[PDB]
Amino acid sequence: QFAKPEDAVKYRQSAGTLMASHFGRMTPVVKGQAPYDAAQIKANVEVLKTLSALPWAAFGPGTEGGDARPEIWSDAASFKQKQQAFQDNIVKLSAAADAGDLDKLRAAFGDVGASCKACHDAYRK
Amino acid sequence: QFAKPEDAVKYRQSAGTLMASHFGRMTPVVKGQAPYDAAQIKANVEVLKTLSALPWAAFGPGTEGGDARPEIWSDAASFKQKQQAFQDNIVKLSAAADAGDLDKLRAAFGDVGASCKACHDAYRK
Ligand code: HEC
Ligand code: HEC
Ligand SMILES: O=N[O-]
Ligand SMILES: O=N[O-]
Ligand SMILES: O=N[O-]
Ligand SMILES: O=N[O-]
């Protein structure tokens, strides 16, 4: 969907920015610093679920560029492994949010965040 | 959800960028230059539906800044009118995509695009 590779760069950056907002805005809730409203969290995690699927096509074949580490494309299968792990952790977070239990939310939130970090540690400068 | 107003700016810019990609990538399909796959379009419009709801909270009270025209905040009720019109056009596009009819998609796509432009003409520099 990208006329030039730089359009893929801008897309994936914007997807990451939105994911950070929808993930990180829950930090006070998972720490107990803000109240837990199950319906609020369920709706927000649905948004995050949608967003969470978006970057990866824009890191696929022919999207070389930007400031990411080049192993995304030279080791594309390894990048996909990190993606799979992340997307599976997102499913667990959706299940926690759908269940309406703060304990499950806390655990799944940590699972997701560690998975974001694992990919960044390998591929983000 | 924004620690400082500039975080709202970056959020809404990123939401617009993603909306442009998910809207504009359908242009070849609505022109007939690319094939119409009803299921493909239905799925893409579901993504656009989610994205389409996201900018507005980040243009609300206390999000003054960026390069947008200041009437967003000085005339907030008028901005909300443009938003309502847009979101109602999105519902029509979702219905067209769900129906699987290219004629309806063409009409609703034009409706949405004109509504994007109407808001931009008033509030985007
Ligand atoms: C690999 C499978 C990734 C996973 C999982 C996540 N991110 Fe990511 N992110 C990735 C790369 C290679 C990069 C660098 C290139 C780029 O897109 O900028 C990033 C970057 C970000 C950014 C910065 C975006 C920007 O505007 O420059 C953010 C804010 C970000 N990523 C957030 C984020 C979150 C919150 C994640 C889990 C919910 C997450 N990323 C997962 C690769 C990968
Ligand atoms: C008002 C109710 C709007 C509607 C409807 C749409 N947009 Fe928008 N957009 C709006 C403003 C005030 C601005 C300027 C400030 C900013 O967010 O940048 C924009 C900007 C954009 C951008 C540029 C984003 C960037 O990175 O700077 C894009 C690509 C964009 N808008 C796209 C877009 C599309 C495709 C819309 C309909 C599907 C649409 N916008 C509606 C305000 C409003
Ligand atoms: O910005 N994450 O692709
Ligand atoms: O996808 N596997 O780490
Ligand atoms: O960028 N649209 O808020
Ligand atoms: O929302 N009315 O133009």
Swiss-Prot record, chains A, B:
- As stated in the Swiss-Prot or TrEMBL entry, residues carrying the post-translational modification Pyrrolidone carboxylic acid are Q1
This protein's UniProt keywords: Electron transport, Heme, Iron, Metal-binding, Periplasm, Pyrrolidone carboxylic acid, Transport
Q: Is the keyword Iron in the record?
A: yes
Q: Which GO terms describe its biological process?
A: electron transport chain
Keyword flag Mitochondrion: no
| A Pfam family the protein falls into | Cytochrom_C_2
Q: Name one GO molecular function term.
A: electron transfer activity
How is this chain modified after translation? Binds 1 heme c group covalently per subunit.
Gene Ontology cellular-component terms listed: periplasmic space
Residues holding heme c: R12, Q13, D67, C116, C119, H120
Q: Where in the cell is it found?
A: Periplasm
Q: Where does this chain mainly localize?
A: periplasm
Q: What does this protein do?
A: Cytochrome c' is the most widely occurring bacterial c-type cytochrome. Cytochromes c' are high-spin proteins and the heme has no sixth ligand. Their exact function is not known.
Q: How does it assemble?
A: Homodimer.
The protein's name in its UniProt record:
Cytochrome c'
Q: Which organism is it from?
A: Alcaligenes xylosoxydans xylosoxydans
Its taxonomic placement starts with: Bacteria, Pseudomonadati, Pseudomonadota, Betaproteobacteria, Burkholderiales
